[PDB]
Amino acid sequence: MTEYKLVVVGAVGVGKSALTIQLIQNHFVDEYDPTIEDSYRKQVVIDGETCLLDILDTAGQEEYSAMRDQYMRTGEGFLCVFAINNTKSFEDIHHYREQIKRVKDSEDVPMVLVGNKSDLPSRTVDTKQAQDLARSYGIPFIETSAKTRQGVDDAFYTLVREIRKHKE
Numbered sequence: 490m491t492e493y494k495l496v497v498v499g500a501v502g503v504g505k506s507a508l509t510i511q512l513i514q515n516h517f518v519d520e521y522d523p524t525i526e527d528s529y530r531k532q533v534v535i536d537g538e539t540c541l542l543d544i545l546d547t548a549g550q551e552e553y554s555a556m557r558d559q560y561m562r563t564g565e566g567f568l569c570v571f572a573i574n575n576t577k578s579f580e581d582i583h584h585y586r587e588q589i590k591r592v593k594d595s596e597d598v599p600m601v602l603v604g605n606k607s608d609l610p611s612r613t614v615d616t617k618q619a620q621d622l623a624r625s626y627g628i629p630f631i632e633t634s635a636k637t638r639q640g641v642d643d644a645f646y647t648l649v650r651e652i653r654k655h656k657e
């Protein structure tokens with residue numbers, strides 16, 4: 490069995506744990522908890538292929554800068570989930586992108602753009618502009634609300650598809 494190695498990163502006020510737990514045990518928590526290092530490993534079926542995903546939830550606080558630059562070339566995919574309600578996290582993505590490219594040492598890298606809190610009428614991040622920004626890198630942008638769970642399953646399939654395309 491192929492063990493997929495990926496991590497979940499994001500800014501403050503995104504609610505990353507809402508999306509992870511939703512797929513892990515189908516549960517949604519409204520409470521906010523700054524998960525520093527929480528393991529979310531589960532058997533996932535991708536295209537009829539049951540595999541083990543080493544999913545880890547990591548917080549992106551400035552308190553851990555050196556620790557965050559310690560190692561990065563040990564992950565296949567970096568789940569960068571932002572919130573459509575947080576315009577800061579949307580613009581911050583550029584910084585994260587630059588960081589990834591710097592360490593990856595390669596431009597050929599499969600990535601996707603998923604946004605959380607799409608169930609909020611308080612939209613700050615425009616989908617049109619997001620599409621343009623995503624198309625600049627060649628990555629797809631999908632709105633994935635954890636509360637109602639809209640297009641989250643399908644989004645995960647596409648995320649892994651690009652990784653498989655990179656494999657072969």
Ligand SMILES: COc1ccc2[nH]cc(CN(C)C)c2c1
Pocket residue numbers: 493494495496543544545560561562563564565
């Ligand atoms: C770079 O740190 C990473 C990246 C991806 C990973 N997949 C699995 C692991 C290890 N696991 C114990 C979290 C991991 C670490």
